[PDB]
Design a protein around this ligand. Structure first.
Ligand SMILES: [Mg+2]
Ligand SMILES: [Zn+2]
Lengths: 52, 191, 200, 160
RNA sequence: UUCAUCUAGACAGCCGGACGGUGGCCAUGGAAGUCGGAAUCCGCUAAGGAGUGUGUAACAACUCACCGGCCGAAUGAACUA
């Protein structure tokens, strides 16, 4: 049991992000392009799947 | 397109003295003196009125002029960093296992020691980088204050504290355990 | 096409200058559209509220200062979210109608405190778990069978002083509303000379 | 516990004793018999049979007092003057019956107090505006056209 | 290259708001803008969509188009090789 504010703060670092679709790399939530060169700095991003 | 001349202004308050050689910046302030080597950036500094310094690049490309604004930000961090200071607040997130953290000395090294992280029996040791002070602030449960002159040392050591507490082999989405910076501000309140 | 769009607004302000002899420049900051929505209702027919973005308005006066030069003193007072309540009726009844809307909104986050809060003895009813706010700010209290008890009147914050996040968040679940919400009359333009609303 | 007064604004199906599966979840918690709410609503909403009309309930410390709020959308439905519909089987019931210009006004006049509009002409536009969603034809004239006509002046709206 | 926004105040940012008819109409048990079907209104307005989203069984509760202060000078979109 964690206080909801603390849970949101931890999720800001663990869950509130995006993923490069081609690369599966973890990227900042509002980033526009993938950071890893293996995916060509692609703009194909998806939101991190949330809990349930 | 090779801009002919690009300029940025760094403001110097009254209580600071800056002496910069070829690229070696020495900022002297109320609580100390900070130094950085900028030999990798190839920029030009020039005084205006001893309270304003101009940093200039002539014939800068798109990448080259990008580092100009970095230098302004990088130096300005010292100017506010030696005057007003940097403090990062950390909270521990733990569902069941409290994170056992304290300060231990081995051979005079001032290591931040972590035990019982999620029931882990590793004793996590993170060095305290030179210049950053470590203190457990009461009136707030499970909170650390990390302070020092240089943003680089305080923030990176703060990250190293976070990085050593990553959860392994588990759903990071639900096992939200860790130590996370809660606030990024200045040591002196509203100065 | 904004030019013809903007110009039509420019005309509308122009007309109100001549017939309406007064103004109520009001500090309408921190008012909901919903709250301000009813504000139009009571004003039906008697008066009207004109507002625009200061940027065009201040220039727009200058273009009108060509023939009506009596608007110099307005220039400094036109800052922030301010509405020109033009007036063709006795000024006293205007403000009385305006000040009426005084919905006290509980511990609005970010809002600057307009009152010297005297925290009289109140038993919270709050759970022990959330009490972290209480201990952090000192706030001498006693958790009597769960029910925290506020001891005595202490002014944590005063008028015109932003409530700190700690007490600001703390004051929300206590549901005390120091933030009486209302259009704040700062000055009053009267037939060629704006004067502070305080006097009226 | 005599005194405590509570308002419970909620629409209810008219001219019928309401569905037990929908009133008990909400009304039940406040201590009111399911049978009572239906009879109060049904008789009060008799003329509104088969029409969901907004009905406030004055609730007084384990007591009730229903009152059909004069909802514009609900009341305009009455204006079409349609006896009880067989909605159970009458899928997609389009209440588009014709209505003369004045009947909008009296509904609008009923809404004059609550609506903030400077004129009944503005108020009629709203009641015309709802009738646009309602679909009612107004003396064989499009409600949008009448609203333009309200501005255009051809259809002189009485101020009262 | 084409089109747009711009000191009659541009983009960005902190946020500087986000109503009423109305819980629009049909059905879903329950859809109150936001599971689906039809159409995409008017009023106060600087402005607010019969609703881009999160979301509740439904509400709710946030949040977003829209612009709702402040700073003050260039910016946005789509294509081209
Ligand atoms: Mg596993
Ligand atoms: Zn990638």
């Amino acid at each position: 049991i964690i206080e909801p504010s603390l849970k949101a703060l931890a999720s800001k670092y663990n869950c509130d992000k995006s993923v490069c679709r081609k690369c599966y790399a973890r990227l900042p939530p509002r980033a526009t392009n993938c950071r890893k060169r293996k995916c060509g700095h692609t703009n194909q991003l998806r939101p991190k799947k949330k809990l349930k | 397109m090779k801009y002919i001349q690009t300029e940025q202004q760094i403001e110097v308050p009254e209580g600071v003295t800056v002496s910069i050689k070829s690229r070696i910046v020495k900022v002297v302030g109320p609580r100390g003196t900070l130094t950085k080597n900028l030999k990798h950036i190839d920029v030009t500094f020039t005084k205006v009125n001893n309270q304003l310094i101009k940093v200039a690049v002539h014939n800068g490309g798109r990448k080259h002029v990008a580092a100009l604004r970095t230098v302004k930000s990088l130096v300005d961090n010292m100017i506010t960093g030696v005057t007003k200071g940097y403090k990062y607040k950390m909270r521990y997130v733990y569902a069941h296992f409290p994170i056992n953290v304290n300060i231990v000395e081995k051979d005079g090294a001032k290591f931040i020691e972590v035990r019982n992280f999620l029931g882990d029996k590793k004793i996590r040791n993170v060095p305290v980088r030179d210049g950053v002070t470590i203190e457990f602030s009461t009136n707030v449960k499970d909170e650390i204050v990390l302070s020092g002159n240089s943003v680089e040392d305080v923030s990176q050591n703060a990250a190293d504290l976070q990085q050593i507490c990553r959860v392994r082999n588990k759903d990071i989405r639900k096992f939200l355990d860790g130590i996370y910076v809660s606030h990024k501000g200045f040591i002196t309140e509203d100065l | 096409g904004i030019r013809e769009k903007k110009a039509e607004y420019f005309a509308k302000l122009r007309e109100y200058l001549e017939e309406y002899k007064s103004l109520f420049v009001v500090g309408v900051d921190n008012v909901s559209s919903q709250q301000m929505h009813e504000v139009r209702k009571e004003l039906r027919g008697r008066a009207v509220v004109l507002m625009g973005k200061n940027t065009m308005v201040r220039r727009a006066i200058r273009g009108f200062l060509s023939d009506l030069p009596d608007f110099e003193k307005l220039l400094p007072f036109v800052k922030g979210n301010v509405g020109f309540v033009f007036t063709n009726e006795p000024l006293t009844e205007i403000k009385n109608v305006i000040v009426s809307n005084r919905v006290a909104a509980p511990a609005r986050a970010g809002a600057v405190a307009p009152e010297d809060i005297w925290v009289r003895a109140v038993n919270t009813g709050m759970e022990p778990g959330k009490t972290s706010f209480f201990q952090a700010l000192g706030v001498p209290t006693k958790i009597a069978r769960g029910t925290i008890e506020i001891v005595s009147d202490v002014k944590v914050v005063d008028a015109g002083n932003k409530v700190g996040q700690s007490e600001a968040s703390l004051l929300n679940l206590l549901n005390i509303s120091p933030f009486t919400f209302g259009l704040t009359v700062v000055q009053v333009y009267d037939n060629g000379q704006v004067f502070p609303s305080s006097i009226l | 516990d005599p005194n405590e007064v509570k308002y419970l604004y909620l629409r209810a199906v008219g001219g019928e004793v309401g569905a037990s599966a929908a009133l008990a979840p909400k009304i039940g918690p406040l201590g009111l018999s399911p049978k009572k709410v239906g009879e109060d609503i049904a008789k009060a909403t008799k003329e509104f049979k088969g029409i969901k009309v907004t009905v406030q309930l004055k609730i007084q410390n384990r007591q009730a007092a229903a009152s059909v709020v004069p909802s514009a959308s609900s009341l305009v439905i009455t204006a079409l003057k349609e006896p009880p519909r067989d909605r159970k089987k009458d899928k997609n019931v389009k209440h588009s019956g014709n209505i003369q210009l004045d009947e909008i006004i009296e509904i609008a006049r009923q809404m004059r107090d609550k609506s903030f509009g400077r004129t009944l002409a503005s108020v009629t536009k709203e009641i015309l505006g709802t009738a646009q969603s309602v679909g009612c034809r107004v003396d064989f004239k499009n409600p949008h056209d009448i609203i333009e006509g309200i501005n255009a002046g051809e259809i002189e709206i009485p101020e009262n």
